[PDB]
Design an enzyme around this catalytic site. Structure first.
Site, PDB file in Angstrom:
ATOM      1  N   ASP A  88      80.172  10.862 -92.744  1.00  0.00           N
ATOM      2  CA  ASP A  88      80.413  11.654 -91.522  1.00  0.00           C
ATOM      3  C   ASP A  88      81.872  11.901 -91.223  1.00  0.00           C
ATOM      4  O   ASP A  88      82.192  12.342 -90.087  1.00  0.00           O
ATOM      5  CB  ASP A  88      79.765  10.988 -90.248  1.00  0.00           C
ATOM      6  CG  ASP A  88      80.206   9.558 -90.052  1.00  0.00           C
ATOM      7  OD1 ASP A  88      81.305   9.178 -90.576  1.00  0.00           O
ATOM      8  OD2 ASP A  88      79.479   8.822 -89.336  1.00  0.00           O
ATOM      9  N   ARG A 127      85.675  14.093 -87.905  1.00  0.00           N
ATOM     10  CA  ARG A 127      84.445  13.361 -87.686  1.00  0.00           C
ATOM     11  C   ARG A 127      83.355  14.329 -87.193  1.00  0.00           C
ATOM     12  O   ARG A 127      83.482  15.079 -86.211  1.00  0.00           O
ATOM     13  CB  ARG A 127      84.730  12.267 -86.630  1.00  0.00           C
ATOM     14  CG  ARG A 127      83.528  11.428 -86.234  1.00  0.00           C
ATOM     15  CD  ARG A 127      82.933  10.591 -87.352  1.00  0.00           C
ATOM     16  NE  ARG A 127      82.038   9.545 -86.879  1.00  0.00           N
ATOM     17  CZ  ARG A 127      80.760   9.780 -86.550  1.00  0.00           C
ATOM     18  NH1 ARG A 127      80.216  11.013 -86.617  1.00  0.00           N
ATOM     19  NH2 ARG A 127      80.000   8.798 -86.163  1.00  0.00           N
ATOM     20  N   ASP A 139      75.572   9.885 -87.085  1.00  0.00           N
ATOM     21  CA  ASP A 139      76.154   8.638 -87.553  1.00  0.00           C
ATOM     22  C   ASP A 139      75.598   8.356 -88.900  1.00  0.00           C
ATOM     23  O   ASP A 139      74.397   8.231 -89.042  1.00  0.00           O
ATOM     24  CB  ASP A 139      75.875   7.542 -86.531  1.00  0.00           C
ATOM     25  CG  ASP A 139      76.666   6.295 -86.796  1.00  0.00           C
ATOM     26  OD1 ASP A 139      77.784   6.448 -87.221  1.00  0.00           O
ATOM     27  OD2 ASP A 139      76.155   5.211 -86.489  1.00  0.00           O
ATOM     28  N   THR A 140      76.447   8.387 -89.905  1.00  0.00           N
ATOM     29  CA  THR A 140      76.097   7.900 -91.260  1.00  0.00           C
ATOM     30  C   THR A 140      76.412   6.402 -91.417  1.00  0.00           C
ATOM     31  O   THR A 140      77.275   5.869 -90.765  1.00  0.00           O
ATOM     32  CB  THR A 140      76.812   8.678 -92.374  1.00  0.00           C
ATOM     33  OG1 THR A 140      78.214   8.703 -92.166  1.00  0.00           O
ATOM     34  CG2 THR A 140      76.320  10.153 -92.459  1.00  0.00           C
ATOM     35  N   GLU A 191      78.163   3.212 -92.957  1.00  0.00           N
ATOM     36  CA  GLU A 191      79.468   3.011 -93.596  1.00  0.00           C
ATOM     37  C   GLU A 191      79.134   2.823 -95.049  1.00  0.00           C
ATOM     38  O   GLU A 191      78.013   2.441 -95.372  1.00  0.00           O
ATOM     39  CB  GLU A 191      80.187   1.765 -93.029  1.00  0.00           C
ATOM     40  CG  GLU A 191      80.496   1.786 -91.520  1.00  0.00           C
ATOM     41  CD  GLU A 191      81.364   2.957 -91.100  1.00  0.00           C
ATOM     42  OE1 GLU A 191      82.234   3.318 -91.925  1.00  0.00           O
ATOM     43  OE2 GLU A 191      81.113   3.576 -90.023  1.00  0.00           O
ATOM     44  N   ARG A 218      90.928  12.103 -84.830  1.00  0.00           N
ATOM     45  CA  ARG A 218      89.985  12.826 -85.690  1.00  0.00           C
ATOM     46  C   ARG A 218      89.487  14.044 -84.954  1.00  0.00           C
ATOM     47  O   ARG A 218      89.135  13.976 -83.766  1.00  0.00           O
ATOM     48  CB  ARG A 218      88.759  11.968 -86.114  1.00  0.00           C
ATOM     49  CG  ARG A 218      89.153  10.671 -86.771  1.00  0.00           C
ATOM     50  CD  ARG A 218      87.998   9.867 -87.273  1.00  0.00           C
ATOM     51  NE  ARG A 218      87.211   9.418 -86.141  1.00  0.00           N
ATOM     52  CZ  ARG A 218      86.128   8.681 -86.234  1.00  0.00           C
ATOM     53  NH1 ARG A 218      85.688   8.215 -87.433  1.00  0.00           N
ATOM     54  NH2 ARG A 218      85.431   8.470 -85.152  1.00  0.00           N
TER      55      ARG A 218
HETATM   56  C1  LIG Z   1      81.162  11.184 -83.126  1.00  0.00           C
HETATM   57  C2  LIG Z   1      82.131  10.729 -82.073  1.00  0.00           C
HETATM   58  C3  LIG Z   1      82.679   9.446 -82.174  1.00  0.00           C
HETATM   59  N1  LIG Z   1      83.591   9.008 -81.245  1.00  0.00           N
HETATM   60  C4  LIG Z   1      84.174   7.655 -81.309  1.00  0.00           C
HETATM   61  C5  LIG Z   1      83.201   6.707 -80.598  1.00  0.00           C
HETATM   62  C6  LIG Z   1      83.239   5.426 -81.394  1.00  0.00           C
HETATM   63  O1  LIG Z   1      84.231   4.529 -80.812  1.00  0.00           O
HETATM   64  P1  LIG Z   1      84.444   3.062 -81.452  1.00  0.00           P
HETATM   65  O2  LIG Z   1      85.383   3.221 -82.643  1.00  0.00           O
HETATM   66  O3  LIG Z   1      85.135   2.445 -80.275  1.00  0.00           O
HETATM   67  O4  LIG Z   1      83.115   2.481 -81.788  1.00  0.00           O
HETATM   68  C7  LIG Z   1      83.668   5.885 -82.792  1.00  0.00           C
HETATM   69  C8  LIG Z   1      82.516   5.977 -83.797  1.00  0.00           C
HETATM   70  O5  LIG Z   1      82.971   6.642 -84.968  1.00  0.00           O
HETATM   71  P2  LIG Z   1      82.488   6.111 -86.386  1.00  0.00           P
HETATM   72  O6  LIG Z   1      80.978   6.150 -86.449  1.00  0.00           O
HETATM   73  O7  LIG Z   1      83.154   7.007 -87.432  1.00  0.00           O
HETATM   74  O8  LIG Z   1      83.025   4.716 -86.490  1.00  0.00           O
HETATM   75  O9  LIG Z   1      84.217   7.173 -82.631  1.00  0.00           O
HETATM   76  C9  LIG Z   1      83.933   9.839 -80.159  1.00  0.00           C
HETATM   77  O10 LIG Z   1      84.736   9.390 -79.295  1.00  0.00           O
HETATM   78  N2  LIG Z   1      83.424  11.067 -80.025  1.00  0.00           N
HETATM   79  C10 LIG Z   1      82.496  11.551 -80.914  1.00  0.00           C
HETATM   80  O11 LIG Z   1      82.002  12.706 -80.711  1.00  0.00           O
HETATM   81 CA   LIG Z   2      79.702   5.980 -89.313  1.00  0.00          CA
END
Ligand SMILES: Cc1cn([C@H]2C[C@H](OP(=O)(O)O)[C@@H](COP(=O)(O)O)O2)c(=O)[nH]c1=O
Ligand SMILES: [Ca+2]
Length: 129
Positions: A15, A29, A34-35, A37, A75
């Site tokens: 993702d 992103r 959510d993919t 890891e 991102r």
């Molecule tokens: C997809 C997405 C993720 N995020 C943030 C929330 C999550 O915070 P945390 O890092 O605090 O968990 C994190 C999850 O991304 P990943 O799934 O790539 O880790 O990215 C956003 O803020 N907005 C979004 O639209």
């Molecule tokens: Ca992920």
């Protein structure tokens, strides 16, 4: 919403992806998914899937939603298209991502993606197997 150009710089995982957008490198992103890891189950299959879809595309596009365009890590937050096919939807349809991180005001394609997940769940695909 509208599609804008970009070019692949490097696949990263299911993702996330490194793209050049308006002539600048940025990690994107994918919205609403959510993919796993890479280290997780179906992580390697998700990364393969997006890697192939991204690298084989003639034309990458990005589509921002109505809300925030970058997350707290810098991102880019977008829907990503490979030769007009949404990567975000394709991942969900194949059971390689869950619909996730649905925030108010950046959720234009929610119900499209939920319809794909229901069909993936019905087929018991991948994550849903
Ligand atoms: C997809 C997405 C993720 N995020 C943030 C929330 C999550 O915070 P945390 O890092 O605090 O968990 C994190 C999850 O991304 P990943 O799934 O790539 O880790 O990215 C956003 O803020 N907005 C979004 O639209
Ligand atoms: Ca992920």
């Amino acid at each position: 919403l509208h599609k804008e150009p970009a070019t692949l710089i490097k696949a990263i995982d299911g993702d996330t992806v490194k793209l050049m957008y308006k002539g600048q490198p940025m990690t994107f992103r994918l919205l609403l998914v959510d993919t796993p890891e890479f280290n997780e189950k179906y992580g390697p299959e998700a990364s393969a899937f997006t890697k192939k879809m991204e690298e084989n595309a003639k034309k990458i596009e990005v589509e921002f939603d109505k809300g925030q365009r970058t997350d707290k890590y810098g991102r880019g937050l977008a829907y990503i298209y490979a030769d007009g096919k949404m990567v975000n939807e394709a991942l969900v349809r194949q059971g390689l991502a869950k619909v996730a991180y649905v925030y108010k005001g950046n959720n234009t394609h929610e119900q499209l993606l939920r319809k794909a997940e229901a069909q993936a769940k019905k087929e018991k695909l991948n994550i849903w197997s």
